[PDB]
């Protein structure tokens, strides 16, 4: 339900929204139309949710990579820039917002990641990734670090993953082949192994996010970060003596950042489509409009020729375009959401040890491909995909279903597939459908095995083997007991991901010892799981997900 006679605009919280609001004030002064600029969290996921019911903003700003998905879902208005207006913007910026031959958004500015370095801490930047460990050892002796950047968004790690041969989709002869994906190849593995090694060697921390890296760089604690033009405003405020420069090489090859074009789409459901056109063409995409936004947070290399020429001599913009030239323009195709979720999952899981680099990238490509081809659309279809993949591995090895050495990798991959898709569809793991699938493999594949414990006649790693062995024991016995094991109202037995819980009486704070899975777990400390007065397991209030309390294990 979008209000006629005004404009609501969504733009990301790292962009110049105060400068965009100034453009909105000038619009209001000439037209009497109020412009509201908002920067909701997760706006790239929020926009398709709310727009799918005819709700949301009149105008949505994001890099062009998300817009094909929006277009395919019918969420975008057709845009109708005449030829004189198109001539005012660079052809390659229009190309970024052309999907199936149609312009689907207005391009605003070209963004690429650069290496940003503290010239006082580090007089010359490193030419290579390989030299960063030695540089960190020197800086650690002085209470500093070499490098901090966002490890939660795969955008920031992609330049290193792509350097030696990682790619999204094969683009040739003007078309993308979504059956030719470059996430699970020797180049992607080399890059992500280098990143995981930086973490294992304590040069970087898997938990570092955008805000932690920005604060550390802007306080002078770290010599280097990786960021885009929008970040320069807060560094200027900090008074750090900074350089913006070419990203370091990996295995002698350039880092290859995915190049974004900040773009503006008009909501299909907007009753304000002509107002939106007027605002974007005659107010924003002018020298005066882009200056107001750029003065708030730098845009990078703007799509408007006349203002790009004016800013072109900024060495920070020169370094931006040098990094852009070495990278690739992101595809705008509908498959980009599934692509980024899969690479997000691979980087987070590999950085935190939840998967090896090979498992992480192999699973990311397999599971993304399940979405790319339209099979998986929701958790029910995801679970059928995970089950079918698992059955295909299990059917040829039937004589060995009671051999842990033969079934432990398939069994582990089934759990990883169920967890990948649970998070993809904003479910907890475990969840009722996932529990039912794991119960089914115990009924179909393991029912004739003589033991509760796995028996045996590149195995899983030490920690993953302990976790999966424990899971297998849980489903062999506690999960299969035919009758209720706690009198009266009770919370149902569950495998929580790390530990097995039996049926527990309503109104009990159940306790077990911390598992021996991690070197930082104290095996004499306690895990708690609360069963409420209605026989429902406790849900953490921040998440509303069913939640076991492991917080005492690593204090």
């Amino acid at each position: 339900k979008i209000e006629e006679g005004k404009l609501v605009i969504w733009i990301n919280g790292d962009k110049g929204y105060n400068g965009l609001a100034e453009v909105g004030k000038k619009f209001e002064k000439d037209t009497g139309i109020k412009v509201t600029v908002e920067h909701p969290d997760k706006l790239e996921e929020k926009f398709p949710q709310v727009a799918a019911t005819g709700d949301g903003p009149d105008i949505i700003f994001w890099a062009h990579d998300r817009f094909g998905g929006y277009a395919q879902s019918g969420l975008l208005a057709e845009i109708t820039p005449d030829k004189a207006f198109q001539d005012k913007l660079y052809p390659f910026t229009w190309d970024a917002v052309r999907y199936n031959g149609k312009l689907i958004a207005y391009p605003i500015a070209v963004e690429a990641l650069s290496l940003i370095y503290n010239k006082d801490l580090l007089p010359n930047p490193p030419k290579t990734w390989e030299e960063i460990p030695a540089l960190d050892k020197e800086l650690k002796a002085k209470g500093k670090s070499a490098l901090m950047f966002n490890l939660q968004e795969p955008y920031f790690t992609w330049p290193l993953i792509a350097a030696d041969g990682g790619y999204a989709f094969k683009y040739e002869n003007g078309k993308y082949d979504i059956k030719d994906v470059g996430v699970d190849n020797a180049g992607a593995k080399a890059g992500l192994t280098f990143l995981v090694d930086l973490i294992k060697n304590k040069h970087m921390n898997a938990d570092t996010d955008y805000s932690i890296a920005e604060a550390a760089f802007n306080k002078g604690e770290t010599a280097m970060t990786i960021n885009g033009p929008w970040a320069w405003s807060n560094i200027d405020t900090s008074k750090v003596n900074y350089g913006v420069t070419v990203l370091p090489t990996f295995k002698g090859q350039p880092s290859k950042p995915f190049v974004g074009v900040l773009s503006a789409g008009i909501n299909a459901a907007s009753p304000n489509k002509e107002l939106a056109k007027e605002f974007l063409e005659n107010y924003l995409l002018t020298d005066e409009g882009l200056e107001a936004v750029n003065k708030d947070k730098p845009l990078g290399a703007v799509a408007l020729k006349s203002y790009e020429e004016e800013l072109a001599k900024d060495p920070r913009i020169a370094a931006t375009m040098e990094n852009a030239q070495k990278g690739e323009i992101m595809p705008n195709i509908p498959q980009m959401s599934a692509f980024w979720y899969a690479v997000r999952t691979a980087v987070i899981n590999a950085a935190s040890g939840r998967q090896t680099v090979d498992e992480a990238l192999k699973d990311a490509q397999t599971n993304a491909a399940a979405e790319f081809g339209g099979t998986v659309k929701n958790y029910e279809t995801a679970v059928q995909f995970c089950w079918n993949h698992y059955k295909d591995q299990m059917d040829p090895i039937e004589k060995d279903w009671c051999d842990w050495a033969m079934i432990s990798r398939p069994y582990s991959t089934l759990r990883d597939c169920l967890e990948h898709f649970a998070e993809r569809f904003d479910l907890g793991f475990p969840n009722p459908l996932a529990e039912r699938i794991i119960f089914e493999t115990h009924q179909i594949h393991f029912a004739n095995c003589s033991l509760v414990q796995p028996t045996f006649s590149i195995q899983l790693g030490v920690t993953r083997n302990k976790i999966m062995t424990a899971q297998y024991e849980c489903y062999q016995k506690i999960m299969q007991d035919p009758i209720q094991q706690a009198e009266g109202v009770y919370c149902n037995r569950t495998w929580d991901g790390w530990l097995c819980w039996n049926d527990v009486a309503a109104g009990t704070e159940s306790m077990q010892l911390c598992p021996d899975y991690f070197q930082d777990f104290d095996p004499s400390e306690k895990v708690t799981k609360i069963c409420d007065q209605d026989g429902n397991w406790f849900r953490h209030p921040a998440s509303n997900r069913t939640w076991t309390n492991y917080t005492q294990c690593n204090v």
Binding site: G353, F429, F518, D520, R545, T551, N554
Partner: peptide, 16 residues
């Protein structure tokens, strides 16, 4: 060897 560090995401409210 055994993993050095329990994943913080899995201890937090969106984890196990």
């Amino acid at each position: 060897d055994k993993d050095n560090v329990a994943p913080r995401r899995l201890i937090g409210p969106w984890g196990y």
